[PDB]
Design an enzyme around this catalytic site. Sequence first.
Site, short mmCIF file in Angstrom:
data_model
loop_
_atom_site.label_atom_id
_atom_site.label_comp_id
_atom_site.label_asym_id
_atom_site.label_seq_id
_atom_site.Cartn_x
_atom_site.Cartn_y
_atom_site.Cartn_z
CG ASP A 122 -8.23 5.46 -4.20
OD1 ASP A 122 -8.72 6.54 -4.59
OD2 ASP A 122 -8.93 4.45 -3.94
CG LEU A 149 -12.11 5.00 1.36
CD1 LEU A 149 -11.78 5.48 -0.08
CD2 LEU A 149 -13.21 3.96 1.38
CD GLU A 190 -3.16 -0.89 0.46
OE1 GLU A 190 -3.43 0.30 0.13
OE2 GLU A 190 -3.86 -1.87 0.10
CG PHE A 197 -5.58 -3.87 4.31
CD1 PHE A 197 -5.30 -2.83 3.42
CD2 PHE A 197 -5.51 -3.62 5.68
CE1 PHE A 197 -4.96 -1.58 3.88
CE2 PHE A 197 -5.17 -2.37 6.15
CZ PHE A 197 -4.87 -1.35 5.29
CG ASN A 245 -9.48 -20.68 -10.21
OD1 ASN A 245 -10.43 -20.48 -9.45
ND2 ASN A 245 -9.63 -21.00 -11.50
CB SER A 258 -9.44 -19.03 -5.52
OG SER A 258 -9.44 -18.85 -6.93
#
Lengths: 164, 164
Positions: free
Chosen positions: B20, B32, B11, B104, B132, B117
């Site tokens: 972003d 955010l 990040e 996250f 996958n 998955s």
Amino acid sequence: MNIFEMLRIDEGLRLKIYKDTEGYYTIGIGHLLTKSPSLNAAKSELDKAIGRNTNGVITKDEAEKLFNQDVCAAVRGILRNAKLKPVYDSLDAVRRAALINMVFQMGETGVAGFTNSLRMLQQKRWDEAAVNLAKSRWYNQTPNRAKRVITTFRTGTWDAYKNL
Amino acid sequence: MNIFEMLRIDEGLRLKIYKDTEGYYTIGIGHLLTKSPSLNAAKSELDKAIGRNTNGVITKDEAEKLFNQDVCAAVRGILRNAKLKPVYDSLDAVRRAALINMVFQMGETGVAGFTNSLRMLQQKRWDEAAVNLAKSRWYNQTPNRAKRVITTFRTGTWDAYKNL
């Protein structure tokens, strides 16, 4: 059972400002607001922490948000600690929680102080660590929670939290 | 290397309000602030979260308080989610961090929709899962980061974070 549910138990949840044992102002799940004796200052610290004027009262969700800060801060400081870290990384998932629990309650400093019990844990000598931990002032101060934390270290199980 | 250091890379840390990818105002480590096109709005969210008049700039310590909040919120949300929880409990500590990283990034709901998955990972079908996952729109949207998270699920090592 996990660290979140386990500390909620050991710490409880209060949605009003209250006094802990040394009598400082507190709310949510063991979240210290201030050492200042002014309850007007605790109400202003609290409004600051939560981001709204609460008039001394918070919601469950606001308490869980402080709680998320505090637990992860606890974990982060264990990881940044030269002495706690290799113990923590050695430990299984349940036992890591026991270690997180102690750091949450008493801070990374005083947990890093248990030189010999920490070594017993690192060496996987569960029964010795359990015995050694039982002799501490920490135990002598909150024996109910300490014994539950020490059972977790000893067994690697969630037994001391089952029944309750 | 742990989930904190891993999401820091993934990040980055920005101490000033930025935009972003879907062009939303963000600060710290992928935090955010708001979906308002407004900046004074995002500045007022930031002020609220930090507890001072920031004017769009924070410290490392402030960014880490929000980060601590977001990570444990990501974990609690896994643990409360009926589809993510048993996958998480079955995973070793490295691959758990890979699942936390996904949650996250895209939230609990959008991770709980990787039906097939998720099932491969729960069954320890690492290569099959890795393959996958690479077919997802998620991978197509942020392939660098996705490939690193998929390597960690695959190998259960921190190879994808070692030489960056």
